[PDB]
Design a protein around this motif. Structure first.
Motif, PDB file in Angstrom:
ATOM      1  N   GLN A 185      37.107 -36.103  50.909  1.00  0.00           N
ATOM      2  CA  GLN A 185      37.581 -34.407  50.147  1.00  0.00           C
ATOM      3  C   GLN A 185      38.361 -33.906  51.204  1.00  0.00           C
ATOM      4  N   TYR A 186      37.399 -34.064  52.399  1.00  0.00           N
ATOM      5  CA  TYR A 186      37.981 -33.212  53.580  1.00  0.00           C
ATOM      6  C   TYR A 186      39.245 -33.512  54.053  1.00  0.00           C
ATOM      7  N   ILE A 187      39.248 -34.690  54.165  1.00  0.00           N
ATOM      8  CA  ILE A 187      40.501 -34.434  55.412  1.00  0.00           C
ATOM      9  C   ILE A 187      42.024 -35.892  53.780  1.00  0.00           C
ATOM     10  N   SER A 219      23.265 -32.657  52.658  1.00  0.00           N
ATOM     11  CA  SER A 219      23.219 -31.638  51.351  1.00  0.00           C
ATOM     12  C   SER A 219      24.963 -31.030  51.925  1.00  0.00           C
ATOM     13  N   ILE A 220      25.068 -31.043  53.775  1.00  0.00           N
ATOM     14  CA  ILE A 220      26.151 -30.844  54.029  1.00  0.00           C
ATOM     15  C   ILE A 220      27.407 -31.539  54.168  1.00  0.00           C
ATOM     16  N   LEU A 221      27.049 -32.364  53.560  1.00  0.00           N
ATOM     17  CA  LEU A 221      28.011 -33.925  53.348  1.00  0.00           C
ATOM     18  C   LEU A 221      28.646 -33.781  52.189  1.00  0.00           C
ATOM     19  N   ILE A 222      27.832 -33.660  51.233  1.00  0.00           N
ATOM     20  CA  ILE A 222      28.287 -33.745  49.529  1.00  0.00           C
ATOM     21  C   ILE A 222      30.133 -33.838  49.391  1.00  0.00           C
ATOM     22  N   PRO A 223      30.004 -32.526  49.745  1.00  0.00           N
ATOM     23  CA  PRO A 223      31.685 -31.124  50.242  1.00  0.00           C
ATOM     24  C   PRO A 223      32.356 -32.213  50.536  1.00  0.00           C
ATOM     25  N   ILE A 224      32.405 -32.604  51.076  1.00  0.00           N
ATOM     26  CA  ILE A 224      32.757 -33.369  52.778  1.00  0.00           C
ATOM     27  C   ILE A 224      33.694 -34.953  52.266  1.00  0.00           C
ATOM     28  N   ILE A 225      33.003 -35.854  51.988  1.00  0.00           N
ATOM     29  CA  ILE A 225      32.515 -37.534  51.825  1.00  0.00           C
ATOM     30  C   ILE A 225      32.866 -37.691  50.656  1.00  0.00           C
ATOM     31  N   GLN A 237      26.218 -36.463  65.971  1.00  0.00           N
ATOM     32  CA  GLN A 237      27.353 -34.891  65.630  1.00  0.00           C
ATOM     33  C   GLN A 237      28.735 -35.446  65.480  1.00  0.00           C
ATOM     34  N   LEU A 238      28.960 -34.315  65.032  1.00  0.00           N
ATOM     35  CA  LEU A 238      30.484 -33.568  64.503  1.00  0.00           C
ATOM     36  C   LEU A 238      31.114 -32.826  65.250  1.00  0.00           C
ATOM     37  N   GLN A 239      32.813 -32.559  65.136  1.00  0.00           N
ATOM     38  CA  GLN A 239      33.036 -31.809  65.653  1.00  0.00           C
ATOM     39  C   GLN A 239      33.874 -31.165  64.657  1.00  0.00           C
ATOM     40  N   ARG A 240      33.306 -29.056  65.004  1.00  0.00           N
ATOM     41  CA  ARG A 240      34.388 -28.212  64.853  1.00  0.00           C
ATOM     42  C   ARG A 240      36.047 -28.026  64.860  1.00  0.00           C
ATOM     43  N   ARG A 241      37.128 -27.438  63.958  1.00  0.00           N
ATOM     44  CA  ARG A 241      38.301 -27.785  64.124  1.00  0.00           C
ATOM     45  C   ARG A 241      38.222 -27.021  65.440  1.00  0.00           C
ATOM     46  N   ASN A 242      38.125 -26.581  65.807  1.00  0.00           N
ATOM     47  CA  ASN A 242      38.244 -25.927  67.621  1.00  0.00           C
ATOM     48  C   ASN A 242      37.561 -27.270  68.599  1.00  0.00           C
ATOM     49  N   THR A 245      36.798 -37.275  64.488  1.00  0.00           N
ATOM     50  CA  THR A 245      35.290 -37.030  64.138  1.00  0.00           C
ATOM     51  C   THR A 245      34.634 -37.556  63.427  1.00  0.00           C
ATOM     52  N   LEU A 246      35.047 -37.329  61.894  1.00  0.00           N
ATOM     53  CA  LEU A 246      34.541 -37.420  60.497  1.00  0.00           C
ATOM     54  C   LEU A 246      35.475 -39.400  60.029  1.00  0.00           C
ATOM     55  N   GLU A 247      36.711 -40.004  60.750  1.00  0.00           N
ATOM     56  CA  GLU A 247      37.136 -41.141  60.762  1.00  0.00           C
ATOM     57  C   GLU A 247      36.261 -42.173  61.568  1.00  0.00           C
ATOM     58  N   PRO A 288      39.669 -32.465  65.813  1.00  0.00           N
ATOM     59  CA  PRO A 288      38.849 -32.908  66.599  1.00  0.00           C
ATOM     60  C   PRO A 288      38.007 -32.908  64.880  1.00  0.00           C
ATOM     61  N   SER A 289      37.794 -31.788  63.959  1.00  0.00           N
ATOM     62  CA  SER A 289      36.661 -31.947  62.757  1.00  0.00           C
ATOM     63  C   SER A 289      37.812 -33.676  62.111  1.00  0.00           C
ATOM     64  N   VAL A 290      38.634 -33.847  62.153  1.00  0.00           N
ATOM     65  CA  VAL A 290      39.362 -34.215  61.095  1.00  0.00           C
ATOM     66  C   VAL A 290      38.603 -36.073  61.947  1.00  0.00           C
ATOM     67  N   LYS A 316      30.690 -28.873  69.131  1.00  0.00           N
ATOM     68  CA  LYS A 316      29.784 -30.456  68.269  1.00  0.00           C
ATOM     69  C   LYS A 316      28.484 -29.288  67.662  1.00  0.00           C
ATOM     70  N   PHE A 317      28.758 -29.897  67.227  1.00  0.00           N
ATOM     71  CA  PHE A 317      27.535 -29.759  65.474  1.00  0.00           C
ATOM     72  C   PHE A 317      26.685 -30.953  65.913  1.00  0.00           C
ATOM     73  N   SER A 318      25.151 -29.905  64.614  1.00  0.00           N
ATOM     74  CA  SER A 318      24.727 -32.028  63.945  1.00  0.00           C
ATOM     75  C   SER A 318      24.333 -31.947  62.890  1.00  0.00           C
ATOM     76  N   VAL A 319      24.220 -32.377  62.213  1.00  0.00           N
ATOM     77  CA  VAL A 319      24.464 -32.707  60.943  1.00  0.00           C
ATOM     78  C   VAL A 319      23.021 -33.520  60.648  1.00  0.00           C
ATOM     79  N   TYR A 320      22.003 -33.133  60.044  1.00  0.00           N
ATOM     80  CA  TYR A 320      20.063 -33.434  59.888  1.00  0.00           C
ATOM     81  C   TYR A 320      19.906 -34.381  58.195  1.00  0.00           C
TER      82      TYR A 320
HETATM   83  C1  LIG Z   1      29.757 -32.249  57.403  1.00  0.00           C
HETATM   84  C2  LIG Z   1      30.902 -31.100  57.836  1.00  0.00           C
HETATM   85  C3  LIG Z   1      30.495 -29.809  57.425  1.00  0.00           C
HETATM   86  C4  LIG Z   1      31.304 -28.351  57.874  1.00  0.00           C
HETATM   87  C5  LIG Z   1      30.845 -27.222  57.313  1.00  0.00           C
HETATM   88  C6  LIG Z   1      32.492 -29.187  58.801  1.00  0.00           C
HETATM   89  C7  LIG Z   1      33.523 -28.105  59.096  1.00  0.00           C
HETATM   90  C8  LIG Z   1      34.343 -27.652  57.950  1.00  0.00           C
HETATM   91  C9  LIG Z   1      35.740 -26.335  58.600  1.00  0.00           C
HETATM   92  C10 LIG Z   1      35.543 -26.403  60.167  1.00  0.00           C
HETATM   93  C11 LIG Z   1      35.736 -24.742  61.083  1.00  0.00           C
HETATM   94  O1  LIG Z   1      36.415 -24.592  60.650  1.00  0.00           O
HETATM   95  O2  LIG Z   1      35.513 -25.401  61.920  1.00  0.00           O
HETATM   96  S1  LIG Z   1      34.051 -27.197  60.084  1.00  0.00           S
HETATM   97  C12 LIG Z   1      33.058 -30.338  58.610  1.00  0.00           C
HETATM   98  C13 LIG Z   1      34.045 -31.130  59.549  1.00  0.00           C
HETATM   99  C14 LIG Z   1      31.873 -31.842  58.558  1.00  0.00           C
END
Ligand SMILES: Cc1cc(C)c(-c2ccc(C(=O)O)s2)c(C)c1
Length: 260
Positions: free
Chosen positions: A179-181, A243-249, A228-233, A203-205, A199-201, A236-240
């Motif tokens: 959904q994010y992409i 719950s955090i993936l349901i909006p994204i995948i 490990q995934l990336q923010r738009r900037n 690293t998800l791919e 980079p957010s896109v 790097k952040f970690s996903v454990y």
């Molecule tokens: C699993 C997961 C969870 C979140 C919150 C994101 C981000 C959404 C907006 C981001 C930003 O403004 O830098 S990062 C991604 C790319 C993947």
């Protein structure tokens, strides 16, 4: 053999027509029967009837050129395409997939198999550019459709073909998977603003297979290792946890059966 076909055109494309297209693609990829932590799992490759193995995406542009991409329902990924009297296939990974693609475009006059697979590593090398340097949007898609169409008479060089596959795979396959992409592409289409994925896109791919494994193997929702995934900037952040993936995948590749 007939497979389900979903049409999209760049000609007078809107946020809604692109969204209706990607929703139709997800609808045809999934039976709905398999869902883990609210996320649908694509069909298992093992035992899957050949008549259910592929879906077709027909893409048309302002020049009224059409190409048909074949997607594998087991991974939502592009396996090849047809342009008029020619069909082109990525080099299959294994003999089972080599046999499977003989069932696509069976009436086409010319069939070609590339020496290379459709993985981004190889396509980026042929294109001479990484995904982070290839713009996406309605304009890039319009151009990619023309490039794919004119390969059939050599009006397209291999680097432009490879760049065109990178555009199509991200705007169709990766949008279907996340959904994010889909959202990133909708923002480009709404505001008429072509840009490379941040980079957010990317690293998800990159992580899709690993996230699919992590979610399905999860201790009732929680991962063994942090992905490990990336923010738009680019930080790097970690996903454990799931719950955090349901909006994204939106879709996962089948890894294992549901846990006990
Ligand atoms: C699993 C997961 C969870 C979140 C919150 C994101 C981000 C959404 C907006 C981001 C930003 O403004 O830098 S990062 C991604 C790319 C993947």
């Amino acid at each position: 053999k007939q497979y389900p076909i979903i049409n999209f055109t760049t000609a007078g494309a809107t946020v809604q027509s692109y969204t209706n297209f990607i929703r139709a693609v997800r609808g045809r990829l999934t039976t709905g029967a398999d869902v883990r932590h609210e996320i649908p799992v694509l069909p298992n490759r093992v035992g899957l009837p050949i008549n259910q193995r592929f879906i077709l995406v027909e893409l048309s542009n302002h020049a009224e050129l059409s190409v048909t991409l074949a997607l594998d329902v087991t991974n939502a990924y592009v396996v090849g395409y047809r342009a008029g009297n020619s069909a082109y296939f990525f080099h299959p990974d294994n003999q089972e997939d080599a046999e499977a693609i003989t069932h696509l475009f069976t009436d086409v006059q010319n069939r070609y198999t590339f020496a290379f697979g459709g993985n981004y590593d190889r396509l980026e090398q042929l294109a001479g550019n990484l995904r982070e340097n290839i713009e996406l949007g309605n304009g890039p898609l319009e151009e990619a459709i023309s490039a794919l169409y004119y390969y059939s008479t050599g009006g397209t060089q291999l680097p432009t073909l490879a760049r065109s596959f990178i555009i199509c795979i991200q705007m169709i396959s990766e949008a279907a998977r996340f959904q994010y992409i889909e959202g990133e592409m909708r923002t480009r289409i709404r505001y008429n603003r072509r840009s490379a994925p941040d980079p957010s896109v990317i690293t998800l791919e990159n992580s899709w297979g690993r996230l699919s494994t992590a979610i399905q193997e999860s201790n009732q929702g929680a991962f063994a290792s942090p992905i490990q995934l990336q923010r738009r900037n680019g930080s790097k952040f970690s996903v454990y946890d799931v719950s955090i993936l349901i909006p994204i995948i939106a879709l996962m590749v089948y890894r294992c059966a549901p846990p006990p």
